[PDB]
Ligand binder design. Structure first.
Ligand SMILES: CC(=O)O[C@H]1C(=O)[C@@]2(C)[C@H]([C@H](OC(=O)c3ccccc3)[C@]3(O)C[C@H](OC(=O)[C@H](O)[C@@H](NC(=O)c4ccccc4)c4ccccc4)C(C)=C1C3(C)C)[C@]1(OC(C)=O)CO[C@@H]1C[C@@H]2O
Ligand SMILES: Nc1nc2c(ncn2[C@@H]2O[C@H](COP(=O)(O)OP(=O)(O)OP(=O)(O)O)[C@@H](O)[C@H]2O)c(=O)[nH]1
Ligand SMILES: Nc1ncnc2c1ncn2[C@@H]1O[C@H](COP(=O)(O)OP(=O)(O)NP(=O)(O)O)[C@@H](O)[C@H]1O
Ligand SMILES: Nc1nc2c(ncn2[C@@H]2O[C@H](COP(=O)(O)OP(=O)(O)O)[C@@H](O)[C@H]2O)c(=O)[nH]1
Ligand SMILES: [Mg+2]
Ligand SMILES: [Mg+2]
Lengths: 440, 430, 370
């Protein structure tokens, strides 16, 4: 059987997990208290889909999750909220203090004494698990606890398990806006972690999702709840193939091998096509061709990165709902006909296609219209490199004068670690530059 | 669980502490008798930060009241919230320092510091995980400056890892209530720069300007100034007591605001301030809060930000609001006033958001600035110090207590070096 | 001034021998090449020091730099150059177990001695050579250590308190009540060094079994007088020679220190960073006015950020000659640390200060009054 374990780190990770588990509980008809009336009504089937929820004797369904944080506030918000009965009481909270936007505190000094408990809980879940597929790690660059503890946790996980897949969903720092001064340092110091240990890292920018909300859904003052709900929709579209039936199903491994031409270039961009409000849901056909075309629009990208400035190394489409392969083939042919989408000359195949019968579900109180069709597109392209270059500039502007360095050095980190991380990032940029050159 | 130990010394420190304990007590629904008569559950979620549980189901603030004159202690006890403080934390003597820094630091305070540290050591030992301390004291006086600096030094020796805040009142440019303000100010600033993590600068001239120009009060008293200060202190530590979209402890600010160890002098501010009758006209929104936060006349430090450059600022919002609006407003403030922010710190605006506003308001905001203009204040003090040290105007009162001219020279040199360090980055084009 | 970054490579160590023991440092004359163990195909990092040395193969003589060569290239040259009224600052910047003591002291019993034996014995023999009725000298020494922003005395008996750092308005920073001594001979200096080295705090770590967890300073104040009273003025020279040992940067990943050890390491790294910053700043400042235009508008050097730079304010820059010995290792684990050290060397090696001081006012007052 098929199952995967979700790990959430930091405030961003915990809140995205709240949204994700709301969506999953809505999807499988599980009440907030863990009970499912459907078993009494339907009396059959597999409504307790084991990909996420473990079933106990009394009919309760405990999610396969491990929340982690250093501030008691964020986890305590969950432990006395609507879903207080859903989760196992083991929430793995450090009751000392937050890392304070510091990589060293999250990785060297305070990250210790808590890594052991997290690994013990994850080992218990793995032993309880059969046919484990992989890990889904949620965290955020820039933040101290997310960066440092994700680094430490991934370092331990690569040793303990090794061959199990590890998909990473992360929030990259924005190009213009930001909520911290030391964001570039924390973001740069995670390059080693994201390179060596992670198997595939998905990146999303707050500015892009704000623009999507402003333009598509017509929301004038969106907050983090809408962002988390959209990210939850992305993850649900990714992981749907393991649960509901489909015509062309794509598990995590076959998804992975079709997106990474080389080991070091596992940074795909993600996008969701039918982001539309209830008012504008009418006056729209939302056929397969329309959503497929809208996937490639520059405005709908989830990261502030123009794909027209680079080449598409690979693409993977995951459709949900009333979809037939004929329309998918027609849309793929139409996309290949276009000029503005430039593909590398060494990937003639181009696209991977998957189709699932379960349509997306509408969370009550949400901002997404009920639609019969949807599609999520995950594309490995070169243009992401440009975004990294921007961040690199900021790092230099703060490292020439050694601003804020003493905070990091006073927590056990050495100064040369900054230069090592910068050199690794430059090597990654050079690798992304070399791969995009046309063969001769 | 993160606990803050509060200390207050001198008349000004004790007054501000009394007003501050009245404000926080309301936010967390605490009766003057100590019993809890609130309505919301969240009031008791993090009560432990400032209060200790008593055996009779009443809450005692974790405060240390310090002085060298029983008059202020008697005034505090015979007050609206005098009964809230436990009697064992009233540490005092007699024969106050009397505006003599040497008496506060060397002669008189040395006899009483032991007792004070003992209470502090006790209060600290009970806490589960101490975040840091905070001290309120005016630098212009004797008891405040002397005993505050001595306690800060001793505590930093005892607790190197913890955080040390300070809400100190600097001497004003024009207003001067004492003749020997510059001496005490110089020595206190010499002591503070070495042994503190943060230091919020407050000036009575700025607070009077706020009371007159903004609030339109006709006859302000020290109660209103203490009200403003206490509002700021309650605003600073909001994230350690309520949930929010983005949390921000005291350390997260210290990390984000202090680029180099010696630059930890901050300019505080608060918004809104509607002046009791104009609130019906203005609509309370995030852009209005940002505008009033970044205004020059709203600052409490009596130093124009436009005469320097912002090294880094932090905004702590309280209330229900959207993150997009806050982020775009901070970005617009950066882009419009491009010349007043340094160029080698991209995105130098920290943001924190809490979703439990003050009881009487829909939204509020606290501003903490770190700019190069603050050097002006120190520069001014230095001039006055020189004007009295060339001729040794009142030196015989200090040297009689054991100090010597050498220490004055060290203090002046350190102050000048701090001013030069701040002036290093206030430039253009490099 | 100068810094004369003595890039030195020592023999292998048991921890290194446990790994693939292959040196990654080579040279040709003044050219120093460092191979990347992880990228041997790449062209090795190349630097041009006149003072790069290689003692990993001690018995060799082909392109072998003995300690006498190091002294000739740095020691007597720097001494005589700074002899005309300067302050000389020799300090050891390096890493843990990076052989920072053999540079400083070396084999006392052998003729392959460190910098201090050669310098002190050469100076002492020089003054003895010029000892006469009308030519006399006077030498004083002092020892101190910095644990964690706290100064302690090593020569004086156990004083559990920490000495208070003061600032004389004319003479600059100094240590209150620090024990100072007068010395007549070189063997006395050796004995005092032995006592001070024993007195310091020491702890063991993986990279080195006897790592020093403090920053040690050894000051020498040396005065010279000639008494041809008819046509000469007594006390015609004084010099300040400062010899400092600096605990190396604590690579926490390569040591795994915990508890108090970690705290010490933390402080050490902080101090080192400040020192590096000063050495990066000072250089640029002295490079700007001396070369560019002579403007001298204003330049700020952050001395006060740490006790080490504060106490060495007179010696690190301003009006002092300096010296660094970059104690490298031939290991692959230390390639990044060596690169950092020599990159700060690239931000050093001139410093360019000015001096000429130490007249005798009272002796010339005889001629003035007469
Ligand atoms: C009709 C109406 O709008 O009433 C308001 C009001 O007029 C204004 C002017 C209030 C009023 O404040 C003042 O008049 C004032 C005078 C001198 C110094 C400071 C304030 C108010 O008193 C203050 C009061 O707010 C509070 O009480 C806050 O919760 C405040 N707590 C206290 O002031 C307090 C005092 C004693 C004991 C316990 C609490 C607070 C602020 C920050 C953090 C924690 C608590 C409010 C909304 C009002 C009145 C009543 C008129 C303002 O209060 C603040 C927080 O500054 C002045 O600026 C705001 C803007 C408000 O519009
Ligand atoms: N998209 C999105 N981003 C978020 C959300 N919450 C926080 N973030 C981002 O996460 C970053 C910091 O997150 P955290 O690491 O969790 O911060 P923290 O929990 O206080 O812990 P420290 O970072 O160590 O201080 C911020 O810069 C935000 O931009 C969210 O709900 N949605
Ligand atoms: N050129 C050399 N020839 C022979 N032996 C040497 C040479 N240089 C160093 N050594 C030896 O290598 C060791 C270097 O000393 P070491 O134990 O590393 O002290 P240290 O590293 O300087 N202490 P520290 O660097 O402050 O942590 C000693 O055993 C020396 O005798
Ligand atoms: N804001 C405010 N300032 C005060 C108050 N009382 C005194 N001050 C200021 O404090 C200074 C005198 O310091 P003082 O309290 O006497 O110090 P101490 O004698 O050492 O305790 C004066 O310059 C006043 O402006 C007060 O209640 N509120
Ligand atoms: Mg975090
Ligand atoms: Mg050594």
């Amino acid at each position: 059987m098929r199952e995967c374990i979700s790990i959430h780190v930091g405030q961003a990770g915990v809140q995205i997990g709240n949204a994700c588990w709301e969506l999953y509980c809505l999807e499988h008809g599980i009440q907030p208290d863990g009970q499912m009336p459907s078993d009494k009504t339907i009396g059959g089937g597999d409504d307790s889909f084991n990909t996420f929820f473990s079933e106990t004797g009394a009919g309760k369904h405990v999610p396969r999750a491990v929340f982690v944080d250093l501030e008691p506030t964020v986890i305590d918000e969950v432990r006395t909220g609507t879903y207080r009965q859903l989760f196992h009481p083991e929430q793995l909270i450090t009751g000392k203090e937050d890392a304070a936007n510091n990589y060293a505190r999250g990785h060297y000094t305070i990250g210790k004494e808590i890594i052991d408990l997290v690994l013990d809980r994850i080992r218990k879940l793995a032993d309880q698990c059969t046919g484990l597929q992989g890990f889904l790690v949620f965290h955020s660059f820039g933040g101290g606890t997310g960066s440092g503890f994700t680094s430490l946790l991934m370092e331990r996980l690569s040793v303990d398990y090794g061959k199990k897949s590890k998909l990473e969903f992360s929030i990259y720092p924005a190009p213009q806006v930001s909520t911290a001064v030391v964001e570039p340092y924390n973001s740069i110091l995670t390059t080693h972690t994201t390179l060596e240990h992670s198997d595939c890292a998905f990146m999303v920018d707050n500015e892009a999702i704000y623009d999507i909300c402003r333009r598509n859904l017509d929301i004038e003052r969106p907050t983090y709840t809408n962002l988390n709900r959209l990210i939850s929709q992305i993850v649900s579209s990714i992981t749907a193939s393991l649960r509901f039936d489909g015509a062309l199903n794509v598990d995590l491994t076959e998804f992975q091998t079709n997106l990474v031409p080389y080991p070091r270039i596992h940074f795909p961009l993600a996008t969701y096509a039918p982001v539309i409000s209830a008012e504008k849901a009418y006056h729209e056909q939302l056929s397969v061709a329309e959503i497929t075309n809208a996937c490639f629009e520059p405005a709908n990208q989830m990261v502030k990165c123009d794909p027209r400035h680079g080449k598409y190394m690979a693409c993977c489409l995951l459709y949900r709902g009333d979809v037939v392969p004929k329309d998918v083939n027609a849309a793929i042919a139409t996309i290949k006909t276009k000029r503005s989408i430039q593909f590398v000359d060494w990937c003639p195949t181009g696209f991977k296609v998957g189709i699932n019968y379960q349509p997306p579900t509408v969370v009550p109180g949400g901002d997404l219209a009920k639609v019969q069709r949807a599609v999520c597109m995950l594309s490995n392209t070169t243009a992401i490199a440009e975004a990294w270059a921007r961040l690199d500039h900021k790092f230099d502007l703060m490292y020439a004068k050694r601003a804020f360095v003493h905070w990091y050095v006073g927590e056990g980190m050495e100064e040369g670690e900054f230069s090592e991380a910068r050199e690794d990032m430059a090597a990654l940029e050079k690798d992304y530059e070399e791969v995009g050159v046309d063969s001769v | 669980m993160r606990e803050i130990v509060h200390i207050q010394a001198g008349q000004c420190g004790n007054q501000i502490g009394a007003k501050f304990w009245e404000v926080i007590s309301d936010e967390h629904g605490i009766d003057p008798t100590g019993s809890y008569h609130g309505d919301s559950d969240l009031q008791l979620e993090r009560i432990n930060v400032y209060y200790n549980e008593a055996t009779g189901n009443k809450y005692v603030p974790r405060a240390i009241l310090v002085d060298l004159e029983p008059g202020t202690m008697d005034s505090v006890r015979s007050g609206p919230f005098g009964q809230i403080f436990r009697p064992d934390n009233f540490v005092f003597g007699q024969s106050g320092a009397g505006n003599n820094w040497a008496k506060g630091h060397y002669t008189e305070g040395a006899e009483l510091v032991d007792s004070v540290l003992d209470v502090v050591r006790k209060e600290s030992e009970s806490c589960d995980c101490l975040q840091g301390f905070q001290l309120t004291h005016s630098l212009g006086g004797g008891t405040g400056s002397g005993m505050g600096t001595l306690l800060i030094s001793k505590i930093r020796e005892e607790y190197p890892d913890r955080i040390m805040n300070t809400f100190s009142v600097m001497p004003s440019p024009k207003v001067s209530d004492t003749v020997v303000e510059p001496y005490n100010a110089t020595l206190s600033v010499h002591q503070l720069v070495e042994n503190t993590d943060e230091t919020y600068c407050i000036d009575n001239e700025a607070l009077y300007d706020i009371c007159f120009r903004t609030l339109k009060l006709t006859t302000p008293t020290y109660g209103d100034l203490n009200h403003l200060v206490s509002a700021t202190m309650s605003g600073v530590t909001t994230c350690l007591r309520f949930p929010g979209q983005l949390n921000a402890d005291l350390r997260k600010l210290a990390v984000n605001m202090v680029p180099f160890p010696r630059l930890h002098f901050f300019m505080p501010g608060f918004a809104p301030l509607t002046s009791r009758g104009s609130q019906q006209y203005r609509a309370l929104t995030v852009p209005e809060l940002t505008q009033q936060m970044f205004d020059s006349k709203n600052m409490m430090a009596a130093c124009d930000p436009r005469h320097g450059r912002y090294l880094t600022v932090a905004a702590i919002f309280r209330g229900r609001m959207s993150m997009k609006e806050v982020d775009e407003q901070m970005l617009n403030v950066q882009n419009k006033n491009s010349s007043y922010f340094v160029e080698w710190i991209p995105n130098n605006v920290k943001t924190a958001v809490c979703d439990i506003p003050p009881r009487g308001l829909k939204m509020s905001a606290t501003f903490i600035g770190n700019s190069t203009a603050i050097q002006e204040l120190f520069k001014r003090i230095s001039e006055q110090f020189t004007a009295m040290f060339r001729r040794k105007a009142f030196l015989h009162w200090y040297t009689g207590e054991g100090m010597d001219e050498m220490e004055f020279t060290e203090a002046e040199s350190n102050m000048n070096d701090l001013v030069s360090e701040y002036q290093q980055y206030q430039d253009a084009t490099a | 001034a100068s810094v004369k970054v003595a890039v030195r490579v020592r023999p292998f160590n048991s921890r290194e021998m446990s790994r693939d023991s292959k040196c990654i440092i080579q040279m040709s004359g003044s050219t120093t090449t460092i191979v990347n163990p992880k990228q041997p195909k790449e062209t090795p990092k190349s630097f041009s020091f006149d003072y790069s040395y290689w003692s990993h193969t001690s018995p060799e003589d082909i392109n072998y730099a003995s300690q006498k060569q190091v002294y000739r290239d740095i020691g007597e040259e720097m001494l005589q150059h700074a002899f005309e009224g300067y302050n000389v600052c020799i300090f050891a910047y390096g890493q843990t177990g990076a052989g920072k003591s053999y540079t400083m002291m070396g084999k006392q019993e052998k003729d392959q001695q460190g910098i201090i034996p050669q310098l002190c014995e050469d100076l002492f023999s020089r003054i003895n050579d010029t000892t006469n009725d009308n030519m006399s000298y006077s030498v004083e020494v002092s020892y101190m250590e910095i644990y964690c922003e706290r100064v302690r005395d090593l020569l004086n008996p156990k004083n559990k308190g920490n000495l208070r750092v003061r600032e004389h308005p004319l003479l600059g920073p100094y240590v209150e009540d620090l024990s100072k001594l007068a010395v007549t001979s070189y063997n006395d200096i050796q004995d005092l060094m032995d006592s001070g080295n024993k007195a310091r705090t020491v702890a063991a770590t993986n990279m080195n079994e006897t790592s020093s967890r403090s920053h040690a300073v050894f000051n020498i104040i040396f005065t010279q007088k000639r008494h041809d009273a008819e046509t000469n003025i007594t006390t015609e020279k004084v010099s300040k020679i400062s010899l400092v040992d600096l605990a190396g940067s604590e690579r926490a990943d390569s040591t795994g220190a915990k508890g108090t050890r970690l705290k010490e390491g933390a402080n050490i790294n902080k101090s080192l960073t400040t020192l590096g910053k000063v050495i990066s700043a000072l250089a640029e400042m002295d490079s700007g006015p001396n070369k560019n235009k002579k403007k001298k508008k204003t330049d700020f050097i952050p001395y006060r950020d740490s006790v080490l730079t504060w106490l060495l304010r007179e010696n690190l820059g301003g009006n002092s000659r300096t010296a660094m010995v970059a104690a490298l290792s031939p290991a692959d684990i230390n390639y990044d640390e060596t690169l950092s050290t020599l990159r700060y060397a690239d931000r050093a090696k001139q410093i360019r200060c000015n001096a000429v001081i130490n007249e005798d006012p009272n002796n010339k007052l005889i001629r003035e009054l007469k």
